[PDB]
Amino acid sequence: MNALIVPQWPLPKGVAACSSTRIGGVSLSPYDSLNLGAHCGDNPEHVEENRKRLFAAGNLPSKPVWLEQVHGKNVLRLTGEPYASKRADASYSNTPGTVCAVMTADCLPVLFCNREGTEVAAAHAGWRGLCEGVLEETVTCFADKPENIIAWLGPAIGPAAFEVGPEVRDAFLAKDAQADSAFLPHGEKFLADIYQLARQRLANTGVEHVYGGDRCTFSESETFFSYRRDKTTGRMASFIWLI
Amino acid sequence: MNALIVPQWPLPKGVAACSSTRIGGVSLSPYDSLNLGAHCGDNPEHVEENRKRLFAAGNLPSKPVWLEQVHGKNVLRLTGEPYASKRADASYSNTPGTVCAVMTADCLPVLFCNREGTEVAAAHAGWRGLCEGVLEETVTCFADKPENIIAWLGPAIGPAAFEVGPEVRDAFLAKDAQADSAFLPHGEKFLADIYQLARQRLANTGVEHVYGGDRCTFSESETFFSYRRDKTTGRMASFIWLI
């Protein structure tokens, strides 16, 4: 329950999705409660416990295909357990029962599916990956046309708290003039709207229906872990699969 | 606390703002608790008590200048009690202590203020007014440049639940063919994203930084009243003022 978030979007018939919160786990501070990350310094046994709880809570049909996220733009087509490499920041699936998933703690998680409910995908979009084109790459994996793809922006660090240096603004500006609107001067730095930037890049590829984007992992401390708030902390995850 | 929502945005020093929920009042079903509306059939005594509670909790400096909302696009500059007509759907103020306020129960409330914190405004944007240009009219009232104006989208009925007939879609398309991206086919009707429409119109005026858009009054029944969900129901309100 409090451990799970159900994306609010015109979800087509044969698709299911969910996102986790820091609530309902067994981990101790700084990972207090539902930490799903096995690589942030938490007790490995606690992480296993939290994953089993969340998987059952979200009714996952199978274990998620965790990726070796490297803040890049590579997408993994989930064709079968035996993979040659899981080094990617997004995954795509058209097979019922296969669970796509991305791990975050401030970075933007994006879930995708077509209106026909036959293809799904999940993308890990920290600022670097987003700037590089992870969302664009994920969209291209779909056989369906972009206009028929809907997307949900998951809980990430919001525009009221996402402070970044000028080099971040420069990186986005060098690739899209409109990215200028997503940065508000904050002293020598800028407050960045990661949701606005995601909507811009998605719109560039032809995606029209984008949902979610109502949260702030930094501010809602009682609900989400935040790397920016607490350098050493837990991790949440967003999942999507064809039923 | 639960009776009030604090807009998450880089609010300048001399500005204050808040938005109510249905929690914390004295009204009974179907207006249970914090109903601030005096024309929806509730106990007038309860509405007064609810108003006193919110005003105190929000720490408003004076009583809100309630408008005779007619779902239009007229903006009322709050220049002094003796008005020829309060028949408007948005108000503007540059006078410390004056409270701008809009009442809603699904319709989109929008709050505005410039980075300098010397001008503010609140708009009631149901689909009719939004389509007519209530947000554009509100921005034009500002002396500051649009790029220096920030906006906060308050709790409204979300796309997953805002089902509208082709007439609503046609109206927006009549104004701008790009508005078509905000309508997802749903049987013989459409699911409209009022936030996306608001962001489109706001961008058109030059406003760059828009916050919020974080809710669904229909779905979050424990937190908001919803006309579409319950025909007979209470009302929430969004406020903003210069200190």
3 state SS of B218:
coil
Do residues B102 and B90 lie in contact, with contact meaning Cβ atoms separated by under 8 Å? Answer: yes
Q: Hey, what are A94's tokens?
A: 């058209």
CA distance B109 to B224: 13
Cα-based angle A134, A137, A143 (whole degrees, multiple of 5): 145
Query: Terminal CA-to-CA distance of chain A, rounded, Å?
Result: 20
> Are A213 and B214 a contacting pair at CB < 8 A?
yes
State the CB neighbour count (10 A cutoff) for residue B83: 14
**Resolution, in Å, please?**
2.0
A187 touches chain B (CB under 8 A): no
Q: Hey, what are A22's tokens?
A: 């820091």
The whole-angstrom distance between B91's CA and the closest CA on chain A is: 25
Cα-based angle B213, B219, B220 (whole degrees, multiple of 5): 75
Do residues A89 and A129 lie in contact, with contact meaning Cβ atoms separated by under 8 Å? Answer: yes
3 state SS of B174:
helix
Do residues B213 and A213 lie in contact, with contact meaning Cβ atoms separated by under 8 Å? Answer: yes
Q: Name the helix (H) or strand (E) containing A101.
A: strand A99-104
Q: How was this structure determined?
A: X-ray
CA distance B153 to B100: 15
Q: For chain B, give the number of residues.
A: 243
Residue the block writes with tokens 């969910």: A18
B187 touches chain A (CB under 8 A): no
B2 touches chain A (CB under 8 A): no
3 state SS of B33:
strand
State the CB neighbour count (10 A cutoff) for residue A28: 12
Do residues A12 and A240 lie in contact, with contact meaning Cβ atoms separated by under 8 Å? Answer: no
Closest CA to B131 of B154, B114, B111, B107: B107
* Amino acid of residue A145: K
- Residue A215: its chain B contacts at CB < 8 A? 214
CA distance B54 to B154: 17
User: Which stretches of chain B are assigned E, i.e. beta strand?
Assistant: 4-5, 15-20, 75-77, 90-93, 99-104, 108-114, 120-125, 149-153, 163-164, 183-186, 189-192, 210-212, 236-242
Side-by-side strand order, sheet with A15-20: A4-5, A15-20, A236-242, A99-104
- Residue B113: its chain A contacts at CB < 8 A? none
- Residue A181: its chain B contacts at CB < 8 A? 203, 208-209
Q: Name the helix (H) or strand (E) containing A151.
A: strand A149-153
Q: What is the CATH number of the domain that holds A204?
A: 3.60.140.10
Q: CB-based contacts of A45: which residues, under 8 Å, 6+ apart? A: none
Q: What is the DSSP letter of B98?
A: P
Q: CB-based contacts of B129: which residues, under 8 Å, 6+ apart? A: B71, B72, B73, B89, B123
The 3-state secondary structure of A31-46 reads: CCECCCCCCCCCCHHH
Q: What is the DSSP letter of B87?
A: -
Interface test with B, best of A114, A211, A222 (most B CBs within 10 A): A211
Q: Are strands A99-104 and B183-186 parallel, antiparallel or unpaired?
A: unpaired
A38: burial class by Cβ within 10 Å (0-12, 13-18, 19+)? middle
Do residues A20 and A103 lie in contact, with contact meaning Cβ atoms separated by under 8 Å? Answer: no
3 state SS of A89:
coil
Which domain does A5 fall in, by range?
A: 1-243
Tally of domains within chain B: 1
A5 touches chain B (CB under 8 A): no
Rg (CA), chain A: 17
Do residues A100 and A162 lie in contact, with contact meaning Cβ atoms separated by under 8 Å? Answer: no
Do residues A114 and A93 lie in contact, with contact meaning Cβ atoms separated by under 8 Å? Answer: no
Do residues B51 and B64 lie in contact, with contact meaning Cβ atoms separated by under 8 Å? Answer: no
State the CB neighbour count (10 A cutoff) for residue A45: 10
Do residues B238 and B19 lie in contact, with contact meaning Cβ atoms separated by under 8 Å? Answer: yes
Do residues A2 and A23 lie in contact, with contact meaning Cβ atoms separated by under 8 Å? Answer: yes
State the CB neighbour count (10 A cutoff) for residue A200: 18
Q: Name the helix (H) or strand (E) containing B197.
A: helix B194-205
> Are A208 and B181 a contacting pair at CB < 8 A?
yes
Query: Terminal CA-to-CA distance of chain B, rounded, Å?
Result: 21
Closest CA to B149 of B178, B116, B191, B193: B116
3 state SS of B64:
coil
